[PDB]
mmCIF file of all heavy atoms in Angstrom:
data_model
loop_
_atom_site.group_PDB
_atom_site.id
_atom_site.type_symbol
_atom_site.label_atom_id
_atom_site.label_comp_id
_atom_site.label_asym_id
_atom_site.label_seq_id
_atom_site.Cartn_x
_atom_site.Cartn_y
_atom_site.Cartn_z
ATOM 1 N N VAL Q 1 -11.388 -144.153 -218.110
ATOM 2 C CA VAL Q 1 -10.400 -143.750 -219.067
ATOM 3 C C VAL Q 1 -10.911 -142.396 -219.576
ATOM 4 O O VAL Q 1 -12.084 -142.165 -219.903
ATOM 5 C CB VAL Q 1 -10.173 -144.920 -220.133
ATOM 6 C CG1 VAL Q 1 -11.118 -146.071 -219.917
ATOM 7 C CG2 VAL Q 1 -10.234 -144.382 -221.529
ATOM 8 N N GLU Q 2 -10.021 -141.419 -219.369
ATOM 9 C CA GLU Q 2 -10.287 -140.038 -219.703
ATOM 10 C C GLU Q 2 -9.693 -139.711 -221.061
ATOM 11 O O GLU Q 2 -8.489 -139.872 -221.294
ATOM 12 C CB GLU Q 2 -9.683 -139.117 -218.661
ATOM 13 C CG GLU Q 2 -10.263 -137.738 -218.857
ATOM 14 C CD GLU Q 2 -9.591 -136.623 -218.089
ATOM 15 O OE1 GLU Q 2 -8.994 -136.871 -217.048
ATOM 16 O OE2 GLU Q 2 -9.674 -135.480 -218.539
ATOM 17 N N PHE Q 3 -10.546 -139.342 -221.992
ATOM 18 C CA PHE Q 3 -10.122 -138.916 -223.304
ATOM 19 C C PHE Q 3 -10.003 -137.412 -223.237
ATOM 20 O O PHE Q 3 -10.880 -136.753 -222.676
ATOM 21 C CB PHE Q 3 -11.155 -139.333 -224.306
ATOM 22 C CG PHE Q 3 -11.271 -140.835 -224.457
ATOM 23 C CD1 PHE Q 3 -12.262 -141.526 -223.777
ATOM 24 C CD2 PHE Q 3 -10.417 -141.505 -225.314
ATOM 25 C CE1 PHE Q 3 -12.377 -142.890 -223.985
ATOM 26 C CE2 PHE Q 3 -10.534 -142.856 -225.521
ATOM 27 C CZ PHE Q 3 -11.521 -143.540 -224.849
ATOM 28 N N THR Q 4 -8.891 -136.863 -223.689
ATOM 29 C CA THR Q 4 -8.686 -135.436 -223.686
ATOM 30 C C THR Q 4 -8.298 -135.024 -225.074
ATOM 31 O O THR Q 4 -7.435 -135.652 -225.690
ATOM 32 C CB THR Q 4 -7.565 -135.011 -222.762
ATOM 33 O OG1 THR Q 4 -7.846 -135.576 -221.499
ATOM 34 C CG2 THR Q 4 -7.494 -133.511 -222.588
ATOM 35 N N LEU Q 5 -8.916 -133.965 -225.569
ATOM 36 C CA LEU Q 5 -8.647 -133.420 -226.889
ATOM 37 C C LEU Q 5 -7.326 -132.663 -226.902
ATOM 38 O O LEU Q 5 -7.106 -131.855 -226.009
ATOM 39 C CB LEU Q 5 -9.730 -132.435 -227.300
ATOM 40 C CG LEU Q 5 -9.578 -131.874 -228.704
ATOM 41 C CD1 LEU Q 5 -9.865 -132.935 -229.726
ATOM 42 C CD2 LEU Q 5 -10.509 -130.708 -228.868
ATOM 43 N N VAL Q 6 -6.461 -132.866 -227.884
ATOM 44 C CA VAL Q 6 -5.245 -132.076 -228.081
ATOM 45 C C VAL Q 6 -5.434 -131.481 -229.492
ATOM 46 O O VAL Q 6 -5.783 -132.182 -230.445
ATOM 47 C CB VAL Q 6 -3.959 -132.983 -228.033
ATOM 48 C CG1 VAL Q 6 -2.641 -132.181 -228.258
ATOM 49 C CG2 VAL Q 6 -3.945 -133.664 -226.667
ATOM 50 N N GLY Q 7 -5.213 -130.187 -229.687
ATOM 51 C CA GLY Q 7 -5.281 -129.625 -231.018
ATOM 52 C C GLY Q 7 -6.598 -128.913 -231.208
ATOM 53 O O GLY Q 7 -7.415 -128.817 -230.289
ATOM 54 N N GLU Q 8 -6.774 -128.395 -232.418
ATOM 55 C CA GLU Q 8 -7.997 -127.676 -232.722
ATOM 56 C C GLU Q 8 -9.048 -128.498 -233.462
ATOM 57 O O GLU Q 8 -10.182 -128.042 -233.551
ATOM 58 C CB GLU Q 8 -7.654 -126.447 -233.536
ATOM 59 C CG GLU Q 8 -6.878 -125.379 -232.755
ATOM 60 C CD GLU Q 8 -6.785 -123.971 -233.414
ATOM 61 O OE1 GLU Q 8 -7.010 -123.804 -234.629
ATOM 62 O OE2 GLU Q 8 -6.476 -123.016 -232.687
ATOM 63 N N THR Q 9 -8.734 -129.660 -234.037
ATOM 64 C CA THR Q 9 -9.676 -130.536 -234.701
ATOM 65 C C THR Q 9 -10.534 -131.239 -233.632
ATOM 66 O O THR Q 9 -10.009 -131.807 -232.673
ATOM 67 C CB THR Q 9 -8.872 -131.537 -235.533
ATOM 68 O OG1 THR Q 9 -8.026 -130.761 -236.370
ATOM 69 C CG2 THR Q 9 -9.709 -132.406 -236.432
ATOM 70 N N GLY Q 10 -11.869 -131.138 -233.778
ATOM 71 C CA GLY Q 10 -12.821 -131.772 -232.893
ATOM 72 C C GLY Q 10 -12.920 -133.244 -233.236
ATOM 73 O O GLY Q 10 -12.758 -133.726 -234.369
ATOM 74 N N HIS Q 11 -13.187 -134.084 -232.255
ATOM 75 C CA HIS Q 11 -13.254 -135.532 -232.449
ATOM 76 C C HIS Q 11 -14.227 -136.022 -231.432
ATOM 77 O O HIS Q 11 -14.623 -135.273 -230.558
ATOM 78 C CB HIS Q 11 -11.925 -136.269 -232.157
ATOM 79 C CG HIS Q 11 -10.714 -135.869 -233.023
ATOM 80 N ND1 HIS Q 11 -10.541 -136.370 -234.230
ATOM 81 C CD2 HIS Q 11 -9.700 -135.039 -232.651
ATOM 82 C CE1 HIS Q 11 -9.381 -135.856 -234.644
ATOM 83 N NE2 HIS Q 11 -8.903 -135.073 -233.693
ATOM 84 N N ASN Q 12 -14.646 -137.252 -231.554
ATOM 85 C CA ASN Q 12 -15.375 -137.846 -230.432
ATOM 86 C C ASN Q 12 -15.037 -139.334 -230.296
ATOM 87 O O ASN Q 12 -14.140 -139.848 -230.989
ATOM 88 C CB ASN Q 12 -16.884 -137.627 -230.626
ATOM 89 C CG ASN Q 12 -17.626 -138.459 -231.634
ATOM 90 O OD1 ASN Q 12 -17.125 -139.233 -232.449
ATOM 91 N ND2 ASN Q 12 -18.921 -138.246 -231.588
ATOM 92 N N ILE Q 13 -15.691 -140.025 -229.351
ATOM 93 C CA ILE Q 13 -15.419 -141.435 -229.128
ATOM 94 C C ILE Q 13 -16.741 -142.152 -228.838
ATOM 95 O O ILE Q 13 -17.548 -141.817 -227.979
ATOM 96 C CB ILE Q 13 -14.286 -141.576 -227.968
ATOM 97 C CG1 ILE Q 13 -14.694 -142.577 -226.953
ATOM 98 C CG2 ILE Q 13 -13.983 -140.277 -227.227
ATOM 99 C CD1 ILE Q 13 -14.281 -143.903 -227.479
ATOM 100 N N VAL Q 14 -16.907 -143.125 -229.699
ATOM 101 C CA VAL Q 14 -18.052 -143.996 -229.749
ATOM 102 C C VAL Q 14 -17.520 -145.429 -229.746
ATOM 103 O O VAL Q 14 -16.632 -145.766 -230.537
ATOM 104 C CB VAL Q 14 -18.825 -143.679 -231.054
ATOM 105 C CG1 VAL Q 14 -19.924 -144.678 -231.248
ATOM 106 C CG2 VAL Q 14 -19.376 -142.260 -231.006
ATOM 107 N N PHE Q 15 -18.019 -146.312 -228.879
ATOM 108 C CA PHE Q 15 -17.657 -147.724 -228.889
ATOM 109 C C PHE Q 15 -18.482 -148.535 -229.855
ATOM 110 O O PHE Q 15 -19.695 -148.321 -230.037
ATOM 111 C CB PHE Q 15 -17.832 -148.327 -227.503
ATOM 112 C CG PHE Q 15 -16.702 -147.946 -226.562
ATOM 113 C CD1 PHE Q 15 -16.748 -146.773 -225.855
ATOM 114 C CD2 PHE Q 15 -15.623 -148.792 -226.446
ATOM 115 C CE1 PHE Q 15 -15.712 -146.429 -225.026
ATOM 116 C CE2 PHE Q 15 -14.590 -148.437 -225.608
ATOM 117 C CZ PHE Q 15 -14.639 -147.262 -224.905
ATOM 118 N N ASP Q 16 -17.783 -149.477 -230.477
ATOM 119 C CA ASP Q 16 -18.404 -150.477 -231.300
ATOM 120 C C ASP Q 16 -19.087 -151.485 -230.382
ATOM 121 O O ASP Q 16 -18.576 -151.822 -229.315
ATOM 122 C CB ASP Q 16 -17.401 -151.203 -232.097
ATOM 123 C CG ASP Q 16 -17.696 -151.035 -233.556
ATOM 124 O OD1 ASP Q 16 -18.799 -151.408 -233.998
ATOM 125 O OD2 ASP Q 16 -16.807 -150.502 -234.229
ATOM 126 N N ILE Q 17 -20.265 -151.987 -230.718
ATOM 127 C CA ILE Q 17 -20.937 -152.905 -229.813
ATOM 128 C C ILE Q 17 -20.772 -154.271 -230.438
ATOM 129 O O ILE Q 17 -21.181 -154.433 -231.593
ATOM 130 C CB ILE Q 17 -22.408 -152.476 -229.669
ATOM 131 C CG1 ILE Q 17 -22.433 -151.089 -229.015
ATOM 132 C CG2 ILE Q 17 -23.181 -153.520 -228.831
ATOM 133 C CD1 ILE Q 17 -23.774 -150.435 -228.703
ATOM 134 N N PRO Q 18 -20.111 -155.242 -229.776
ATOM 135 C CA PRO Q 18 -19.817 -156.555 -230.349
ATOM 136 C C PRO Q 18 -21.130 -157.245 -230.695
ATOM 137 O O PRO Q 18 -22.027 -157.269 -229.852
ATOM 138 C CB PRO Q 18 -19.041 -157.260 -229.269
ATOM 139 C CG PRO Q 18 -18.626 -156.179 -228.279
ATOM 140 C CD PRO Q 18 -19.786 -155.209 -228.351
ATOM 141 N N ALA Q 19 -21.374 -157.750 -231.902
ATOM 142 C CA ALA Q 19 -22.622 -158.467 -232.147
ATOM 143 C C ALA Q 19 -22.456 -159.785 -231.373
ATOM 144 O O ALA Q 19 -21.388 -160.421 -231.269
ATOM 145 C CB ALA Q 19 -22.846 -158.784 -233.633
ATOM 146 N N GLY Q 20 -23.567 -160.042 -230.690
ATOM 147 C CA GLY Q 20 -23.659 -161.195 -229.833
ATOM 148 C C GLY Q 20 -23.517 -160.788 -228.384
ATOM 149 O O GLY Q 20 -23.796 -161.605 -227.499
ATOM 150 N N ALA Q 21 -23.081 -159.546 -228.134
ATOM 151 C CA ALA Q 21 -22.986 -159.017 -226.792
ATOM 152 C C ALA Q 21 -24.319 -159.091 -226.028
ATOM 153 O O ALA Q 21 -25.390 -158.716 -226.551
ATOM 154 C CB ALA Q 21 -22.531 -157.557 -226.839
ATOM 155 N N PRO Q 22 -24.304 -159.581 -224.774
ATOM 156 C CA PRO Q 22 -25.413 -159.431 -223.856
ATOM 157 C C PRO Q 22 -25.820 -157.979 -223.733
ATOM 158 O O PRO Q 22 -25.013 -157.059 -223.844
ATOM 159 C CB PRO Q 22 -24.918 -160.008 -222.577
ATOM 160 C CG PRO Q 22 -23.430 -159.887 -222.695
ATOM 161 C CD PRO Q 22 -23.181 -160.249 -224.135
ATOM 162 N N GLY Q 23 -27.086 -157.777 -223.438
ATOM 163 C CA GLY Q 23 -27.670 -156.471 -223.308
ATOM 164 C C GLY Q 23 -26.994 -155.692 -222.235
ATOM 165 O O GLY Q 23 -27.027 -154.471 -222.315
ATOM 166 N N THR Q 24 -26.361 -156.305 -221.226
ATOM 167 C CA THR Q 24 -25.667 -155.528 -220.191
ATOM 168 C C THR Q 24 -24.381 -154.874 -220.718
ATOM 169 O O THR Q 24 -24.064 -153.738 -220.375
ATOM 170 C CB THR Q 24 -25.322 -156.416 -218.975
ATOM 171 O OG1 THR Q 24 -24.711 -157.594 -219.489
ATOM 172 C CG2 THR Q 24 -26.537 -156.700 -218.125
ATOM 173 N N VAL Q 25 -23.642 -155.606 -221.541
ATOM 174 C CA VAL Q 25 -22.458 -155.108 -222.239
ATOM 175 C C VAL Q 25 -22.914 -154.039 -223.248
ATOM 176 O O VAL Q 25 -22.263 -152.993 -223.277
ATOM 177 C CB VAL Q 25 -21.769 -156.302 -222.936
ATOM 178 C CG1 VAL Q 25 -20.612 -155.886 -223.807
ATOM 179 C CG2 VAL Q 25 -21.285 -157.227 -221.840
ATOM 180 N N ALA Q 26 -23.983 -154.207 -224.050
ATOM 181 C CA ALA Q 26 -24.474 -153.161 -224.949
ATOM 182 C C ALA Q 26 -24.906 -151.908 -224.209
ATOM 183 O O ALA Q 26 -24.514 -150.813 -224.661
ATOM 184 C CB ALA Q 26 -25.660 -153.636 -225.775
ATOM 185 N N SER Q 27 -25.619 -151.942 -223.074
ATOM 186 C CA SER Q 27 -25.883 -150.722 -222.338
ATOM 187 C C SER Q 27 -24.677 -150.001 -221.826
ATOM 188 O O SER Q 27 -24.654 -148.773 -221.781
ATOM 189 C CB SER Q 27 -26.724 -150.949 -221.126
ATOM 190 O OG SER Q 27 -27.888 -151.491 -221.699
ATOM 191 N N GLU Q 28 -23.681 -150.782 -221.416
ATOM 192 C CA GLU Q 28 -22.468 -150.241 -220.845
ATOM 193 C C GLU Q 28 -21.634 -149.489 -221.891
ATOM 194 O O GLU Q 28 -21.200 -148.377 -221.662
ATOM 195 C CB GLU Q 28 -21.770 -151.444 -220.242
ATOM 196 C CG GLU Q 28 -20.465 -151.144 -219.604
ATOM 197 C CD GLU Q 28 -19.984 -152.310 -218.768
ATOM 198 O OE1 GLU Q 28 -19.854 -153.416 -219.265
ATOM 199 O OE2 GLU Q 28 -19.742 -152.099 -217.605
ATOM 200 N N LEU Q 29 -21.462 -150.093 -223.052
ATOM 201 C CA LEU Q 29 -20.764 -149.548 -224.198
ATOM 202 C C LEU Q 29 -21.448 -148.312 -224.750
ATOM 203 O O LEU Q 29 -20.775 -147.324 -225.077
ATOM 204 C CB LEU Q 29 -20.676 -150.654 -225.219
ATOM 205 C CG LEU Q 29 -19.419 -151.430 -225.360
ATOM 206 C CD1 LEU Q 29 -18.641 -151.527 -224.096
ATOM 207 C CD2 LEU Q 29 -19.799 -152.759 -225.855
ATOM 208 N N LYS Q 30 -22.798 -148.318 -224.801
ATOM 209 C CA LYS Q 30 -23.548 -147.118 -225.188
ATOM 210 C C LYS Q 30 -23.357 -146.020 -224.170
ATOM 211 O O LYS Q 30 -23.051 -144.906 -224.563
ATOM 212 C CB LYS Q 30 -25.043 -147.419 -225.320
ATOM 213 C CG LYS Q 30 -25.252 -148.087 -226.656
ATOM 214 C CD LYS Q 30 -26.740 -148.199 -226.913
ATOM 215 C CE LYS Q 30 -27.003 -148.411 -228.411
ATOM 216 N NZ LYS Q 30 -28.432 -148.332 -228.732
ATOM 217 N N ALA Q 31 -23.485 -146.237 -222.862
ATOM 218 C CA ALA Q 31 -23.203 -145.239 -221.859
ATOM 219 C C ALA Q 31 -21.753 -144.762 -221.855
ATOM 220 O O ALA Q 31 -21.425 -143.706 -221.335
ATOM 221 C CB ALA Q 31 -23.497 -145.803 -220.491
ATOM 222 N N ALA Q 32 -20.837 -145.567 -222.341
ATOM 223 C CA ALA Q 32 -19.445 -145.190 -222.472
ATOM 224 C C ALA Q 32 -19.162 -144.506 -223.835
ATOM 225 O O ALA Q 32 -18.009 -144.308 -224.230
ATOM 226 C CB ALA Q 32 -18.623 -146.474 -222.313
ATOM 227 N N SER Q 33 -20.198 -144.148 -224.610
ATOM 228 C CA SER Q 33 -20.027 -143.515 -225.899
ATOM 229 C C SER Q 33 -20.569 -142.103 -225.873
ATOM 230 O O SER Q 33 -21.469 -141.775 -225.093
ATOM 231 C CB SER Q 33 -20.764 -144.248 -226.918
ATOM 232 O OG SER Q 33 -20.262 -145.540 -227.092
ATOM 233 N N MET Q 34 -19.970 -141.252 -226.724
ATOM 234 C CA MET Q 34 -20.442 -139.892 -226.968
ATOM 235 C C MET Q 34 -21.585 -139.939 -227.981
ATOM 236 O O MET Q 34 -21.658 -140.809 -228.854
ATOM 237 C CB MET Q 34 -19.360 -138.971 -227.579
ATOM 238 C CG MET Q 34 -18.544 -138.397 -226.459
ATOM 239 S SD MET Q 34 -17.095 -137.474 -227.002
ATOM 240 C CE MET Q 34 -17.857 -135.880 -226.923
ATOM 241 N N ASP Q 35 -22.477 -138.966 -227.931
ATOM 242 C CA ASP Q 35 -23.564 -138.896 -228.879
ATOM 243 C C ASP Q 35 -23.009 -138.504 -230.244
ATOM 244 O O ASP Q 35 -21.991 -137.821 -230.331
ATOM 245 C CB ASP Q 35 -24.536 -137.864 -228.270
ATOM 246 C CG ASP Q 35 -25.809 -137.447 -229.020
ATOM 247 O OD1 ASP Q 35 -26.413 -138.269 -229.716
ATOM 248 O OD2 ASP Q 35 -26.200 -136.278 -228.880
ATOM 249 N N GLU Q 36 -23.670 -138.907 -231.321
ATOM 250 C CA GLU Q 36 -23.416 -138.431 -232.694
ATOM 251 C C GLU Q 36 -23.213 -136.920 -232.826
ATOM 252 O O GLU Q 36 -22.375 -136.418 -233.559
ATOM 253 C CB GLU Q 36 -24.610 -138.803 -233.618
ATOM 254 C CG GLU Q 36 -25.003 -137.871 -234.836
ATOM 255 C CD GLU Q 36 -26.421 -137.255 -234.882
ATOM 256 O OE1 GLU Q 36 -26.847 -136.576 -233.939
ATOM 257 O OE2 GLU Q 36 -27.097 -137.458 -235.898
ATOM 258 N N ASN Q 37 -24.061 -136.166 -232.162
ATOM 259 C CA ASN Q 37 -24.053 -134.741 -232.298
ATOM 260 C C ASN Q 37 -23.180 -134.133 -231.229
ATOM 261 O O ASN Q 37 -23.426 -133.022 -230.772
ATOM 262 C CB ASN Q 37 -25.497 -134.289 -232.191
ATOM 263 C CG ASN Q 37 -25.730 -132.871 -232.677
ATOM 264 O OD1 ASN Q 37 -25.508 -132.531 -233.833
ATOM 265 N ND2 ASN Q 37 -26.224 -131.969 -231.869
ATOM 266 N N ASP Q 38 -22.140 -134.827 -230.779
ATOM 267 C CA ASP Q 38 -21.266 -134.345 -229.724
ATOM 268 C C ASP Q 38 -19.839 -134.424 -230.256
ATOM 269 O O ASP Q 38 -19.458 -135.452 -230.812
ATOM 270 C CB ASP Q 38 -21.443 -135.250 -228.561
ATOM 271 C CG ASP Q 38 -21.278 -134.646 -227.190
ATOM 272 O OD1 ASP Q 38 -20.399 -133.803 -226.978
ATOM 273 O OD2 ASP Q 38 -22.040 -135.061 -226.310
ATOM 274 N N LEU Q 39 -19.054 -133.359 -230.130
ATOM 275 C CA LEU Q 39 -17.650 -133.350 -230.507
ATOM 276 C C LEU Q 39 -16.909 -132.710 -229.348
ATOM 277 O O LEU Q 39 -17.437 -131.792 -228.710
ATOM 278 C CB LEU Q 39 -17.363 -132.516 -231.773
ATOM 279 C CG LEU Q 39 -17.684 -133.046 -233.177
ATOM 280 C CD1 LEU Q 39 -17.304 -132.025 -234.237
ATOM 281 C CD2 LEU Q 39 -16.876 -134.268 -233.478
ATOM 282 N N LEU Q 40 -15.709 -133.194 -228.998
ATOM 283 C CA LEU Q 40 -14.854 -132.573 -227.992
ATOM 284 C C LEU Q 40 -14.372 -131.269 -228.636
ATOM 285 O O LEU Q 40 -14.191 -131.198 -229.853
ATOM 286 C CB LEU Q 40 -13.629 -133.446 -227.668
ATOM 287 C CG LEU Q 40 -13.858 -134.840 -227.070
ATOM 288 C CD1 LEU Q 40 -12.617 -135.669 -227.294
ATOM 289 C CD2 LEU Q 40 -14.289 -134.724 -225.628
#
């Protein structure tokens, strides 16, 4: 899923990690997230 910025306001996308999630789901969700210091 490709997120594309529209407009001049910068944004990013970070996934919430479900508490109780197996470590495989937590690694996947983290790899599918942008860093804190990253904005489109």
